[PDB]
Design a binder for this molecule. Structure first.
Ligand SMILES: CCCCCCCCCCCCOS(=O)(=O)O
Ligand SMILES: CCCCCCCCCCCCOS(=O)(=O)O
Lengths: 158, 158
């Protein structure tokens, strides 16, 4: 567990709805470098199921097309930590959110890592980006990407 | 002139020798995203000519090969600003250096921008990266890349 920042008292129900991946960062350049990189994902919506699991609707550029993807992150005993179903055990951690404006999360396996600043609106939230940068300084990131309001309103941020 | 930070009293002679492109950033994701992106360049050496011009030896990934490139940046009336010979008028600005450890520079045309933290050794200089990040906050960057000591000792940082 490289990431040692989580949101205390996370109410997973209140993060439902629309988000924009305003920024992203990864421990490894190649995790995010090209449009088809395996962890370049854009979140459209989070749907917490009644059980306390979390469905994630996102867009990912695959075979020269912006593809929809639905994935479920299964709840654990820690309210801010969730398991995604890949080959290898993948954890999603919610580092921080104010529910109504911004949410910071990371995903790690077990050695490498990707994190995002999620925002509710197609706007550059300087304050949320500050928080994101501060959460990141204590992590070994090597690629950071940011998106403007025009790209935010486009499929796969083109 | 988006960039309004320059090094006062720059002695261009004393920046000669070996440098490592430890970090890079650009106003536009696509300027740096893939290995063949037009401004993903790695500096090996700076040779200031007796006239006060600056020759730059660098590596750039082109047609599936790490290619050498020699370019000359022509001196202007400002000692920290140089003109490179492209189609459109290109300026190199030296923002800051202590000559012996680190050098921060940017290149801009005339709307978009790329900057680097150059270091003398194949080491992660936290202090120089602080300076680089601080010089950048006052700029509209959207992609940031960092390299580790292993990648630094490789052609084109592979
Ligand atoms: C606050 C919760 C936010 C969590 C969203 C992170 C999910 C991204 C993981 C993609 C899985 C791998 O990509 S996939 O294309 O194969 O599905
Ligand atoms: C402190 C001085 C450092 C300046 C180095 C910046 C030069 C990079 C510009 C590449 C030109 C375009 O790329 S090229 O491949 O066509 O040559």
């Amino acid at each position: 567990l490289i990431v040692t920042q989580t949101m205390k008292g996370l109410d997973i129900q209140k993060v439902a709805g629309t988000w924009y991946s305003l920024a992203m960062a990864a421990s490894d350049i190649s995790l995010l470098d090209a449009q088809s990189a395996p962890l370049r994902v854009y979140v459209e919506e989070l749907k917490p199921t009644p059980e306390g699991d979390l469905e994630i609707l996102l867009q990912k550029w695959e075979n020269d097309e912006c593809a929809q993807k639905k994935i479920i992150a299964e709840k654990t005993k820690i309210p801010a930590v969730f398991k995604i179903d890949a080959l290898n055990e993948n954890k999603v951690l919610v580092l921080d959110t104010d529910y109504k404006k911004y949410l910071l999360f990371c995903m790690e396996n077990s050695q490498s890592l990707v994190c995002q600043c999620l925002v509710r609106t197609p706007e550059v939230d300087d304050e949320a980006l500050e928080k994101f940068d501060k959460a990141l300084k204590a992590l070994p990131m090597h690629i950071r990407l940011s998106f403007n309001p025009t790209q935010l309103e486009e499929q796969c941020h083109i």
